[PDB]
Design a protein around this nucleic acid. Structure first.
Ligand SMILES: [Mg+2]
Ligand SMILES: [Mg+2]
Ligand SMILES: [Mg+2]
Ligand SMILES: [Mg+2]
Ligand SMILES: [Mg+2]
Ligand SMILES: [Mg+2]
Ligand SMILES: [Mg+2]
Ligand SMILES: [Mg+2]
Ligand SMILES: [Mg+2]
Ligand SMILES: [Mg+2]
Ligand SMILES: [Mg+2]
Ligand SMILES: [Mg+2]
Ligand SMILES: [Mg+2]
Ligand SMILES: [Mg+2]
Ligand SMILES: [Mg+2]
Ligand SMILES: [Mg+2]
Ligand SMILES: [Mg+2]
Ligand SMILES: [Mg+2]
Ligand code: NA
Ligand code: NA
Ligand code: NA
Ligand code: NA
Ligand code: NA
Ligand code: NA
Lengths: 205, 94, 171, 59, 142, 37
RNA sequence: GCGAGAGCUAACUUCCGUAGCCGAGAGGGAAACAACCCAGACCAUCAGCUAAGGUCCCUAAAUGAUCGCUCAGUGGUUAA
RNA sequence: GAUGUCGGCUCGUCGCAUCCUGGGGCUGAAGAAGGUCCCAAGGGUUGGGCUGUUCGCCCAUUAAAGCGGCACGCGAGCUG
RNA sequence: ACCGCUGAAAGCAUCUAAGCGGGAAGCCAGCCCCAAGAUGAGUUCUCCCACUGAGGUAAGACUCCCGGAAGACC
């Protein structure tokens, strides 16, 4: 249900009680509400929400027009949510509590054109027994005269990375209201300064 | 058709099978089977009451068509010229 | 074949269209059947006649007569099944109107009746199922018995009053 | 082609192609057969008359 | 020597399907689409009338709705992902039942698929009528 | 539940009951529960 | 296909006898398909009758008539 | 006028006559552990000694260490 | 698979013909990702607008430059 947008700032050490908890700092800047998607007026229930602030000199006339309807301030990023529909704007306070589990999603770092050993784990071949197919290079791709063809959606070299990724059940260690900061036990995908979306625990234990 | 153009037609010169009698303006009487002469629909047999008169226009020679045959892998290729002859008749009857 | 049908004075039989509606003091009860099968109240009692005399008309005849009889007896006196909790340490409680099963399982078994059926516990080792519709009753009690099938060694669980269960005996 | 038109015509009144042609066989009267399609396509009234004739030369 | 084609014909016919079995309905529709009476009667171009199916959700069958009748919906590479669904299991998308029972009875060429465009199925009573501004000539099966 | 393609009587308590297109046999004796399916 | 041998009364098996077709045979049917069923292509035609086969829709042609069967999706793979 | 042969390695995917987990009936099923049958292919199905081995035997474990198919899958992928 | 309720033909019996319930790592949905070229191409918010006798233009974008936790080139 509820959630917000922020920036991955980094990972650091942090003891809680008597144990060393690795955490990942996230800036959940205040998020304005720019549009209310009513199912009646649209077709589904949702809320549009903005993040990084932009200079009006950089904002398209149309986009300015959009922002004027609610009249907050031009922002660089907009996204939507579900079942979320409160009043005012979207600060992580009251939203997330320390101890609550959360689904943290973002765009991974991408690795470009990675082989199969990297991409799909694979296993490649013997490095000593006399080859020409060391490191990677896959084995075969099919069978033979039967379906003389390779299966749709199979394991080959490709673009690894740049994917939407959602990690589930992360613990909210600490929350600094006013500094608009939040700490999350463990690692979140994507790079520092990356966009992250922190959503309520969807289907949890 | 098969021979002899019946039906209702408003003075038109058509082209059908030859009509033996060579020449021109040879009165050609034909039996009817249907027609809308004066918006009066008349079926067969009864139509025998009315008959079509036509005059021969010219004895034209058909359009040139080459007759080709072929069976693969056995050779057999055949090529021969052909044009089926006719005559034009000017319809002008009851 | 079945004809004699006991129709008292507290019952109301309505053969309107295909939906046959029966009114009574214990509550009204609707019972659907066929349209090709003739059925009405001739004089005092109720007589059910069949079109053909082969099989596709007699089966449904018996069926229908039976069902109707059940509706009547249902709105006249009502149906009630008597169960029994036999075994060691077996018992059942009551919460409002739901039945609380306690029979060897770690956590008690809550069973919530549907709309028209009611439980009763006049004794900690005996279950009473009361209801209007006989079918429903049967099905709910059936669910109660389904919780612990009498084992072929001691015969525990649920049983109908004087059920004859033969113990195989292991040793 | 011609057939495909003829049975359509037939059907526009309450008969079919089988019934219709057959209702011209029973009567040596109508022996059009060829061109009939053109008649059902251009002159509807005429073809109606033919249908009516077919029914009249049947039952 | 026969009759040329036109295009003035464009009747907007609406076929109810409430209670009617899937065959009669299907064949009827497909037939009117291809060419029921056929204007110029030509096979080159599509002269069929436009068919609008209402209800459809209340289509009738025999006894094998839950059984036997299994529409098959298979993927690109069905590597163990050969999707199969019962015909009642099409409460999800009713329009698919009829829609995808008629297309089978229409040619497989270019023009065929062009014809599928004239088929318009709606699951509902008075609602589908809002999708109907042109002719609304309603013609029952039999 | 012994699946036999040849279900026949074995005593005087066996009763053949035709179900949903399947051959089943009821009996007080639970060892006499034969079924083709 | 029939009548035999050989072969496990197997093989699109092999070896003889006999009939037909293919080989050198187009066309219609059997989805596709040498052989099977119907039929032997001189040439032309916006003509008609039939055979084998069929006549809801995808192709032409009665969602034809009367008396039955089968709750099976048999038809639309087999036996004790 | 060429359809590259065994085994391994690599990479897969499918059948179900199911090795393990799942749901059942029956028992010479007290319990625990099993036996047998029926339903069920979602996932999983270890590492080593000898041998070119596929098999197979053995060490040590495992819920289990299933059987087959794909030109006894895979040499314009490797080995030899 | 299997286990039951009401219950005829065998005016007994019966999970069954009408009807209904419970029940598997399987099926469908649920979870993560893609997805309108879903050519039936969908929905919503906002912007510039009613020129000229193919071309000046608005909104807007591209080229070019400097870079990048983006990347073979794009
Ligand atoms: Mg390596
Ligand atoms: Mg190869
Ligand atoms: Mg292929
Ligand atoms: Mg031979
Ligand atoms: Mg030769
Ligand atoms: Mg053919
Ligand atoms: Mg004929
Ligand atoms: Mg015949
Ligand atoms: Mg037809
Ligand atoms: Mg079959
Ligand atoms: Mg070669
Ligand atoms: Mg080669
Ligand atoms: Mg099995
Ligand atoms: Mg045990
Ligand atoms: Mg060695
Ligand atoms: Mg082999
Ligand atoms: Mg090999
Ligand atoms: Mg060697
Ligand atoms: Na010959
Ligand atoms: Na065949
Ligand atoms: Na498997
Ligand atoms: Na091993
Ligand atoms: Na294998
Ligand atoms: Na090479």
């Amino acid at each position: 249900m509820k959630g917000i947008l922020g920036t991955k700032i980094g990972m650091t050490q942090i003891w809680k009680n008597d144990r060393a908890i690795p955490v990942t700092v996230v800036l959940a800047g205040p998020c304005p509400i720019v549009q209310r998607k009513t199912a009646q007026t649209d077709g589904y229930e949702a809320v549009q929400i903005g993040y990084a602030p932009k200079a009006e000199r950089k904002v398209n006339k149309p986009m300015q027009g959009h922002f004027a309807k609610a009249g907050v301030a031009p922002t660089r990023i907009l996204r939507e949510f579900r079942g979320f529909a409160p009043d005012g704007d979207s600060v992580n306070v009251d939203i997330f509590a320390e101890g609550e589990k959360i689904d943290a999603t973002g765009t991974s770092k991408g690795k470009g054109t990675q082989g199969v050993m990297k991409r799909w784990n694979f296993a490649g071949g013997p490095a000593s027994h006399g080859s020409k197919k060391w490191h990677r290079r896959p084995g075969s791709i099919g069978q033979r005269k039967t379906p003389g063809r390779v299966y749709k959606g199979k394991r080959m070299a490709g673009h690894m990375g740049m994917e939407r990724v959602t990690v589930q059940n992360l613990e909210v260690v600490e929350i600094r209201a006013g500094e608009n900061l939040i700490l999350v036990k463990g690692a979140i995908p994507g790079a520092n300064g990356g966009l992250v979306v922190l959503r309520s625990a969807a289907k949890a234990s | 058709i098969q021979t002899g153009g019946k039906q209702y037609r408003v003075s038109e010169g058509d082209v059908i099978r030859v009509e033996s009698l060579q020449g021109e303006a040879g009165d050609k009487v034909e039996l009817k089977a249907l027609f809308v002469g004066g918006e009066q629909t008349v079926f067969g047999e009864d139509a025998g009451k009315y008959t079509v008169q036509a005059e021969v226009v010219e004895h034209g020679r058909g359009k040139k068509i080459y007759i080709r045959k072929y069976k693969s892998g056995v050779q057999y290729r055949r090529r021969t010229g052909h044009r089926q002859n006719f005559t034009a008749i000017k319809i002008l009857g009851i | 074949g079945k004809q004699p049908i006991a129709v008292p004075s507290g019952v109301t039989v309505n053969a309107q269209d295909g939906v046959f509606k029966v009114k009574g003091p214990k509550g009204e009860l609707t019972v659907p059947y066929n349209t090709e099968l003739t059925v009405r109240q001739d004089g005092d009692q109720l007589l059910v006649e069949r079109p053909s005399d082969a099989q596709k008309h007699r089966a449904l005849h018996g069926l229908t007569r039976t069902l109707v009889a059940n509706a009547v007896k249902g709105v006249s006196d009502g149906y009630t099944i008597n169960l029994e909790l036999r075994g060691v340490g077996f018992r059942a409680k009551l919460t409002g109107k739901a039945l609380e099963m306690n029979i060897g399982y770690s956590h008690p078994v809550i069973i919530e009746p549907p709309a028209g059926v009611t439980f009763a516990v006049p004794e900690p080792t005996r279950i009473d199922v009361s209801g209007i519709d006989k079918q429903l009753v049967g099905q709910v009690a059936a669910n109660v018995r389904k919780v612990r099938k009498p084992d072929a060694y001691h015969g525990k669980g649920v049983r109908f009053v004087g059920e004859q269960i033969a113990l195989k005996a292991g040793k | 082609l011609w057939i495909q038109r003829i049975n359509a015509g037939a059907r526009l009144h309450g008969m079919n192609y089988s019934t219709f042609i057959n209702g011209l066989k029973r009567a040596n009267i109508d022996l059009n057969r060829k061109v009939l399609a053109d008649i059902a396509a251009r002159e509807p009234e005429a073809f109606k008359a033919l249908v009516d004739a077919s029914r009249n030369a049947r039952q | 020597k026969t009759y040329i084609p036109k295009n003035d014909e464009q009747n907007w016919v609406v076929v109810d399907a409430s209670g009617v079995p899937l065959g009669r309905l299907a064949t009827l529709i497909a037939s009117r689409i291809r060419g029921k009476h056929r204007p110029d009667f030509t096979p080159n171009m599509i002269q069929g009338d436009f068919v609008v199916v209402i209800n459809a959700a209340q289509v009738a069958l025999t006894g094998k709705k839950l059984d036997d009748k299994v529409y098959t919906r298979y993927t690109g590479y069905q590597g163990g992902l050969k999707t199969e669904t019962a015909r009642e299991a099409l409460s999800k998308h009713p329009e698919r039942v009829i829609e995808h029972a008629v297309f089978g009875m229409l040619p497989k060429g270019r023009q065929g698929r062009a014809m599928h465009t004239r088929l318009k199925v709606y699951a509902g009573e008075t609602h589908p009528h809002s999708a109907q501004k042109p002719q609304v000539l309603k013609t029952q099966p039999l | 539940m012994k699946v036999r393609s040849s279900v026949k009587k074995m005593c005087d308590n066996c009763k053949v009951v035709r179900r949903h297109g399947r051959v089943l046999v009821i009996c007080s004796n639970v060892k006499h529960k034969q079924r083709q399916g």
